[PDB]
Write a protein that binds this ligand. Structure first.
Ligand SMILES: [Mg+2]
Ligand SMILES: [Mg+2]
Ligand SMILES: [Mg+2]
Ligand SMILES: [Mg+2]
Ligand SMILES: [Mg+2]
Ligand SMILES: [Mg+2]
Ligand SMILES: [Mg+2]
Ligand SMILES: [Mg+2]
Ligand SMILES: [Mg+2]
Ligand SMILES: [Mg+2]
Ligand SMILES: [Zn+2]
Lengths: 216, 37, 176, 144
RNA sequence: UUGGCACCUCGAUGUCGGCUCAUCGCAUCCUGGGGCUGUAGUCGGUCCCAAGGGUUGGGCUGUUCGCCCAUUAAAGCGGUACGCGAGCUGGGUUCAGAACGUCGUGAGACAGUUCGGUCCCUAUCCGUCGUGGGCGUAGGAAAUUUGAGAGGAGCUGUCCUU
RNA sequence: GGGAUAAGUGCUGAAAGCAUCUAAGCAUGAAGCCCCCCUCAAGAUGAGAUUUCCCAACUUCGGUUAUAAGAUCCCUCAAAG
């Protein structure tokens, strides 16, 4: 069981061995370092904390997240690493196989590996029931004054309320999503990229987490 | 299995027993298996 | 309870020792240990044992009977053991031993493997007579039940796995 | 002439007790513990103030039921979502969360008031024979 | 369900059907597990467990029903103000026009028919869907987190081989 | 895939010398139950955990102070709205 963090670069395609067209997502996964090692003894569970994508060193009057603050710098310097942009834990890996400070190269994965990919899906802002919940429209003609409304929200005296879970307009997307059983099509160690079969959640430049697929 | 409120012997080989709180008939003849309900 | 009142004969080679409720019986074939009803007393004679119940209540009579029966079963199991014999009916229905486990081929598209358990021995004769031998009467019965439930007897031709002495009701399958 | 003593925070002394659930009947232990938590055993009992004592219950996993309650006493709860009933038998709850079993049985015998909630907060339940409150120097308490 | 009663509402509790959105029961239509069979097999019959999910498009009619066409694993039965008109429609039905049959001397009338015929409301509270601020969490902070709980999901055809 | 079950299927077994799936005891057994899979989640006031960062003066010596780490105002923006 393996894990790594990258950035979604974009989609493209490759031709397989029989000429089949394989859509792929390019994930750039450079600069992964084991920052912390969590154990049952100290933390109560086993996991490796991985930091991804070096950021700049601490400076006095930093005004953005580009520069590490002192807490983050101390945390990373404990691992001996440069401060990192994204930090995520992998509980699915065997901690005994990792050392704090160790590099996690794209080569940990091999072509054919089946993987789960997790990301934050693209945001859509405030959306209505048709888009957000895929509901049916009312008639567009024949006297209708019901086109994109969400429909009845309850019944009557029984129950004199709307039940929790009613589907209504609201903010759409920006949710953690895991797509299961994708495949590693190619690993390019020179460019530090993984070609994953299919599409993965999130915008371009978005953080993606690749793990060995839980189901097998 | 016959499930019915009236459970009783159908032939001389039927045997009235009680299992798990339920009156039943067991018999060599499978047609005569009964369970009260 | 006549069964409860009845005394258990111990063969000279069989030794029964009690530890409170828990009892254990050793003999030529093996050792059997179990915990008996805590409210039953035991008169341990040199050559025999007797179960004694405190009262004549319903519960005491039931437990006296069952305790006597269980202890006698343990003694006879260590002495002589217990055996259950099944037979296979149906052309092509066969059994064989894959070492200690028993593999059956009974009209399925795959063989069925039954893994032997501790203190139990399977033996196949003529490829169509399985016998389970053990010291635990209960264990022997359970494993024989599993073997037979792999494919029990169907009524129209008797095919399947049956106990050798079992009577299988027969039906006239086809009529005009 | 009005002369009834009224306890208040200046003169209330709360002790710590330990009660062993092992071999005890759930409801009977619970009613007694509730009395202790409410302070009903003190001659200075004052309804508008917490005069009760702290209780630690140990060996909650060894509490016992009569009859067929182990499989037939069912605890229901509702998630406030349509169709959101969830149930657990008393035996299953004793296996998986005896602390909650004892806590809930006892807290069902305390009033649903602010003071009742506060008083129920003075209960500590543990499935095993150890508790982490040796600092409070609790005394063993014999039921009945 | 058809009714009986006349207890809430006549300083108004909108009424059929459909649309949108569901939610619950099980007396279960399919799928899952069984017993019996006048169960050879393939199919069936009947009963028991089981409510997780699933349970179709059209023709006619305002229709609900119902019949029909063609499918499907199946085309379940009920409750929720015969769920849902401050969410939609407004074809039926009980305003004013007109007409036929009928009754009536007549004015008119008919759970007879026919053609036509105004559906208002800027959400205060609870409720529900999202999204911020405060304070708390016994110092002030940046990250990574356990998971008590909660929600989601949960369906199935056909073919090949044996 | 796992655990516990329903209807069932049994093993051993007396009450009741027999019989009996049941009383004690031991198995097995559903798309169902609890998990396993996905998501939210410590206002879980029971407010949890780990790593890292900051750490002095003045004081009616209770306390205060602006500062520290840090975060903002304001400004350029978008993958967010
Ligand atoms: Mg439409
Ligand atoms: Mg319009
Ligand atoms: Mg009858
Ligand atoms: Mg009024
Ligand atoms: Mg039912
Ligand atoms: Mg109404
Ligand atoms: Mg209605
Ligand atoms: Mg309304
Ligand atoms: Mg009209
Ligand atoms: Mg006339
Ligand atoms: Zn009979």
């Amino acid at each position: 069981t393996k894990g790594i963090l990258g950035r979604k670069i974009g989609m493209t395609q490759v031709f397989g061995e029989n000429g089949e067209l394989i859509p792929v997502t390019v994930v750039e996964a450079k600069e992964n370092v084991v920052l912390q090692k969590k154990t049952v003894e100290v933390d109560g569970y086993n996991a490796i904390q991985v930091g991804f994508e070096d950021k700049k060193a601490y400076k006095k009057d930093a005004k953005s997240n580009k520069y590490a603050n002192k807490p983050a710098e101390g945390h990373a310097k404990k691992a001996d690493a440069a401060p990192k942009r994204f930090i995520r834990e992998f509980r699915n890996v065997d901690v005994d196989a990792y050392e704090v400070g160790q590099e996690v190269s794209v080569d940990t994965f091999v072509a054919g590996d089946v993987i789960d990919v997790t990301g934050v899906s693209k945001g859509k802002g405030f959306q209505g029931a048709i888009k957000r919940h895929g509901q049916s429209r009312g008639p567009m003609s024949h006297g209708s004054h019901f086109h994109r409304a969400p429909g009845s929200v309850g019944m009557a005296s029984d129950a004199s309320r709307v039940f929790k879970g009613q589907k209504m307009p609201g903010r759409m997307g920006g949710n953690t999503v895991t797509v299961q059983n994708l495949e590693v099509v190619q690993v390019d160690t020179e460019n530090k990229v993984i070609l994953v079969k299919g599409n993965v959640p999130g915008p371009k430049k978005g953080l993606v987490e690749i793990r060995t697929s839980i189901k097998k | 299995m016959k499930v019915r409120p009236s459970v009783k012997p159908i032939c001389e080989k039927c045997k009235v027993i009680k299992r798990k709180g339920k009156v039943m008939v067991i018999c060599e003849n499978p047609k005569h298996k009964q369970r009260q309900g | 309870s006549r069964v409860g009142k009845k005394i258990i004969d111990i063969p000279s080679d069989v030794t029964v020792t009690f530890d409170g409720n828990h009892v254990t019986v050793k003999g030529p074939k093996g050792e059997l240990s179990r915990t008996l009803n805590e409210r039953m007393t035991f008169k341990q004679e040199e050559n025999t044992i007797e179960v004694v119940r405190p009262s004549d209540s319903k519960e005491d009579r039931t437990n006296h009977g069952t305790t006597r029966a269980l202890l006698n079963n343990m003694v006879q199991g260590v002495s002589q053991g217990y055996v259950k014999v099944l037979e296979l009916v149906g052309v092509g229905y066969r059994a064989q031993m894959q070492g200690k486990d028993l593999i059956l081929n009974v009209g399925y598209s795959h063989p069925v493997e039954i893994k032997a358990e501790e203190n139990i021995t399977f033996s196949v004769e003529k490829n169509t007579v399985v016998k389970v031998e053990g010291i635990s009467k209960e264990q022997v019965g359970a494993l024989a039940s599993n073997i037979r439930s792999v494919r029990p007897p169907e009524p129209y031709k008797g095919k399947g796995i049956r106990y050798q002495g079992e009577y299988v009701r027969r039906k006239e399958g086809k009529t005009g | 002439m009005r002369q009834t003593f009224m306890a208040n925070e200046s003169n209330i002394e709360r002790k710590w007790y330990v009660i062993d659930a092992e071999g005890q009947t759930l409801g009977r232990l619970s009613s007694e513990v509730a009395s202790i938590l409410r302070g009903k055993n003190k001659v200075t009992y004052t309804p508008h103030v917490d005069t009760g004592d702290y209780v630690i219950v140990i060996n909650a996993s060894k509490i016992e039921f009569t009859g067929n309650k182990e499989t037939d006493k069912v605890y229901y709860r509702h998630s406030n979502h349509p169709g959101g009933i969830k149930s657990i038998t008393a035996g299953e709850l004793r296996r998986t969360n005896p602390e909650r079993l004892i806590e809930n049985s006892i807290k069902g015998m305390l009033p649903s008031t602010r003071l009742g909630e506060k008083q129920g907060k003075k209960l500590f339940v543990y499935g095993g024979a150890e508790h982490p409150h040796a600092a409070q120097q609790p005394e063993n308490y014999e039921l009945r």
